[PDB]
């Protein structure tokens, strides 16, 4: 008890040593090399109607033509996004939604909410109609984030502290993830598809494995909750945008944050980032009503998509690198390049 | 300059948008409603009386106007992280109970729903959402305010243990909690356990806030 | 899936008739309907065409005007009236289904088909009307049209369906080299704009019968002239 707080301090002042020797330099004091790459000038190509209430996810397609977008008027759609043709639109149980997921073959799409069920639904049918295949229960609180594994394996987190791996044939968890403290908001799978990250609504995030349920890393160092996370392409790295109006940018082998992300006429939480495929342009949503493009190896630039007459709450790229959707409580979906 | 197979998908997507303006026109004629209360504080008897796991779902039809009231009470998290999802309901159903002036936690209820209602009435996404405001088992209250009076929980308090005057001060104590007066706006009554007259006063309520938001809405 | 026709027969000289197809197993309301026809000895031929919401239809310019072809979703059933029939009108007719969103696949399930008696577009034909093979050859067939179907948007509207003895048409190659469901990988097909070519590997039994080529790039439809592997 006693002895162990005095070995975990002891452990902690080690780790606080270990990060602090290896920084000989900084990011910034190092990348100071470096053209910026000035403005980006980006502009509306299609504008996509239809909804009719706010919109709190959307989720690109690896063909990179088409979308799935989710709105708390009980619709998922479906989006041909080079004539603005609608494919299909799907209705809800239940109209408290707050994410989406596309799967990578093409055949299924997952979606859940306020209700603490995590839906799964198949598109390929001979029917030709789409139709529910599954239903994952278990979780005590609320529903955040899912994202496909394959046509068989969902990961899922909740705001209760937990984290669950799911076996969608069957229906019962496989493994299941704990040790936060508060609520869980969102987690991005690495590109080799072998681990995963988890930030919680205590400003602290986890670098988390995948057939052992036992977390690898841990990081610190915002004041407040994390509010959106994802991961850079080359499989160590991540960009965390917190709700004290901050973003940085953490590393895993270096073991501790190196470059902040912030601005001083910026007072709102950031509610979504998403990273451009080379590195060069970290794109992030705000509650002042714009869509900030950073650069994210200056932390010296915003060029804005301003377009929308409400909070931005979703954003993301292609495969191929030559769009961006943006989607924001004012029901409007836009197509930028 | 369309083949013969991009008119088809043209008209698949017309068809898609006709079904979902009917929807949605369908839709955009119901009434929403946040219900809110401290634990033991009887929103369960307002369920109840009128005939009527996460999130749970009740509606009913009053007067030509369907009522969708949600229940979230069930979940035990952080309560800062969805009232944004709620930011569009018509009014907040606020419950508290009387009987429990005196019925120490520490101090007592009626000091932990002075504290909800204070944190709630005031929050930054409700400046235009009106609380409708509940006061239950206002019987046993009386019952007992004839032997011990609100002076252990109220010391300021001038009257004697008569029923008006008690009634009154709590009430007033907190109407006045409501610090944006020339926007938001309180509603009270007493739980007619026996009378039908709640849900008319339900309806009143939302037609007030109806006609009000109508005005604001063109310019007028 | 399941479609169903009816309403064959004789009929003389004159007078009319009509047709009635039932449909049960999908969500017939949102698939578009197709009447196609063929002679006793000859190729197919392409009928009259209705779509999802009755807001299109199209005919041939053979016999345009003496053909009606509707439809009735709330009890599933496709119906053609057909009057003042010739001698020139004694064939067998069917019922095909199609749906076209981004990366369907039409024509792909076919009825079984009815029997009558009577008492300046793009041309494709077939090279040879009958080729010899054995087990364990590699066939190959051709096609021929006078124009391009490459459209500017990337698409080529050959299609590719074989016909066994005594069944129905079954899909094998949709938009020209696209595999339908069901059907095993040895097949394949390519071409380049106006000469186009399909090849099966490994020929096996239940292989053998007539192979048809069609295009879909512009109403009217036109089929080929039909070739039959002899073994």
């Known amino acids: 008890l006693d002895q162990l707080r005095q070995e975990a301090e002891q452990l902690k002042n080690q780790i606080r040593d270990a990060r602090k020797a290896c920084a000989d330099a900084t990011l910034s004091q190092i990348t100071n090399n470096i053209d910026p790459v000035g403005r980006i000038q980006m502009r509306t190509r299609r504008t996509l109607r239809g909804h009719l209430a706010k919109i709190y996810a959307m989720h690109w397609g690896t063909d990179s033509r088409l979308l799935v977008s989710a709105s708390q008027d009980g619709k998922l759609i479906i989006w041909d996004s080079y004539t603005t043709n609608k494919v299909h639109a799907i209705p809800l149980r239940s109209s408290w939604v707050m994410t989406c997921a596309y799967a990578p073959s093409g055949n299924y799409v997952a979606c859940g909410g306020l209700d603490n069920i995590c839906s799964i639904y198949n598109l390929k049918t001979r029917e030709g109609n789409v139709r529910v295949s599954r239903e994952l229960a278990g979780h005590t609180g609320y529903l955040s984030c899912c994202r496909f594994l394959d046509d068989n394996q969902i990961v899922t987190s909740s705001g209760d502290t937990t984290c669950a791996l799911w076996d969608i044939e069957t229906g019962q968890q496989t493994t299941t993830f704990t040790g936060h403290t508060g609520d869980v908001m969102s987690l991005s799978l690495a590109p080799d598809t072998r681990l995963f990250v988890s930030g919680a609504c205590d400003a602290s995030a986890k670098l988390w494995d995948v057939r052992e349920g036992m977390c690898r890393q841990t990081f610190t160092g915002h004041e407040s909750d994390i509010n959106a996370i994802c991961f850079f392409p080359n499989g160590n790295a991540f960009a965390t945008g917190s709700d004290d109006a901050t973003c940085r940018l953490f590393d895993l082998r270096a073991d501790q944050e190196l470059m902040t992300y912030s601005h001083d006429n910026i007072i709102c939480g950031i509610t979504s980032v998403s990273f451009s495929k080379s590195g060069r342009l970290l794109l992030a949503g705000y509650d002042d009503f714009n869509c900030n493009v950073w650069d994210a190896l200056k932390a010296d630039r915003a060029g804005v998509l301003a377009g929308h007459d409400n909070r931005v709450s979703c954003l993301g790229v292609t495969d191929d690198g030559m769009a961006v959707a943006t989607g924001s409580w004012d029901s409007f979906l836009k197509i930028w390049n | 300059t369309l083949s013969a197979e991009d008119k088809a998908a043209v008209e698949r997507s017309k068809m898609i948008d006709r079904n979902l303006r009917e929807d949605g026109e369908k839709a955009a004629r119901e009434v929403k409603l946040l219900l809110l209360g401290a634990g033991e504080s009887g929103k369960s008897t307002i369920v109840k009386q009128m005939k009527i796991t996460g999130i749970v779902e009740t509606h009913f039809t009053f007067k030509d106007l369907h009522f969708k009231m949600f229940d979230v009470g069930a979940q035990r998290s952080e309560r800062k992280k969805w009232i944004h999802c709620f930011e569009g309901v018509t009014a907040i159903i606020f419950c508290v109970a009387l009987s429990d002036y005196d019925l120490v936690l520490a101090m007592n209820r009626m000091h932990e729903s002075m504290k909800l209602f204070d944190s709630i009435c005031n929050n930054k996404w409700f400046t235009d959402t009106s609380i409708i405001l509940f006061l239950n088992k206002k019987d046993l209250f009386e019952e007992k305010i004839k032997k011990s009076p609100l002076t252990i929980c109220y010391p300021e308090y001038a009257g004697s243990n008569t029923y008006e005057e008690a009634a009154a001060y709590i009430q007033c104590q907190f109407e006045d909690l409501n610090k944006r007066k020339d926007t938001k706006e309180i509603y009270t009554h007493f739980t007619c356990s026996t009378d039908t007259k709640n849900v008319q006063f339900v309806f009143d309520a939302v037609t007030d806030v109806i006609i009000k938001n109508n005005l604001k809405d063109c310019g007028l | 899936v399941q479609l169903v026709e009816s309403g064959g027969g004789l009929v003389q000289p004159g007078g009319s008739r009509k047709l009635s197809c039932s449909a049960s197993?999908?969500?017939?309301?949102?698939?578009?309907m197709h009447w196609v026809r063929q002679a006793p000895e000859k190729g197919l031929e392409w009928v009259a065409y209705?779509?999802?919401?009755?807001?299109?239809?199209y005919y041939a310019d053979t016999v345009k005007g003496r053909f009606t072809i509707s439809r009735d979703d709330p009890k599933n059933t496709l119906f053609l009236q057909m009057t003042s029939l010739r001698s020139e009108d004694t064939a067998m007719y069917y019922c095909?289904?199609?749906?076209?969103?981004?990366?369907?696949?039409?024509?792909?399930?076919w009825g079984q088909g009815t029997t009558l008696t009577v008492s300046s577009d793009i041309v494709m034909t077939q090279a040879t009307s009958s080729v010899p093979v054995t087990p364990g050859e590699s066939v190959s067939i051709s096609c021929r049209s006078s124009?391009?179907?490459?459209?500017?948007?990337?698409?080529?509207?050959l299609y590719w369906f074989l016909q066994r003895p005594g069944q129905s048409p079954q899909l094998l190659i949709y938009?020209?080299?696209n595999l339908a469901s069901g059907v095993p990988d040895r097949f394949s097909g390519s071409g380049s704009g106006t000469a186009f070519t399909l090849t099966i590997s490994r020929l096996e039994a239940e292989d053998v019968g007539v192979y048809y080529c069609?295009?879909?790039?512009?109403?009217?439809?036109?089929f080929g002239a039909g070739t039959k592997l002899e073994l």
């Open positions: 209705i779509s999802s919401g009755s807001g299109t239809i």
């Open positions: 124009k391009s179907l490459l459209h500017s948007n990337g698409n080529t509207y």
């Open positions: 069609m295009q879909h790039l512009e109403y009217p439809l036109t």
């Open positions: 938009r020209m080299s």
């Open positions: 095909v289904r199609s749906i076209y969103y981004y990366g369907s696949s039409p024509f792909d399930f």
């Open positions: 197993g999908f969500a017939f309301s949102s698939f578009g």
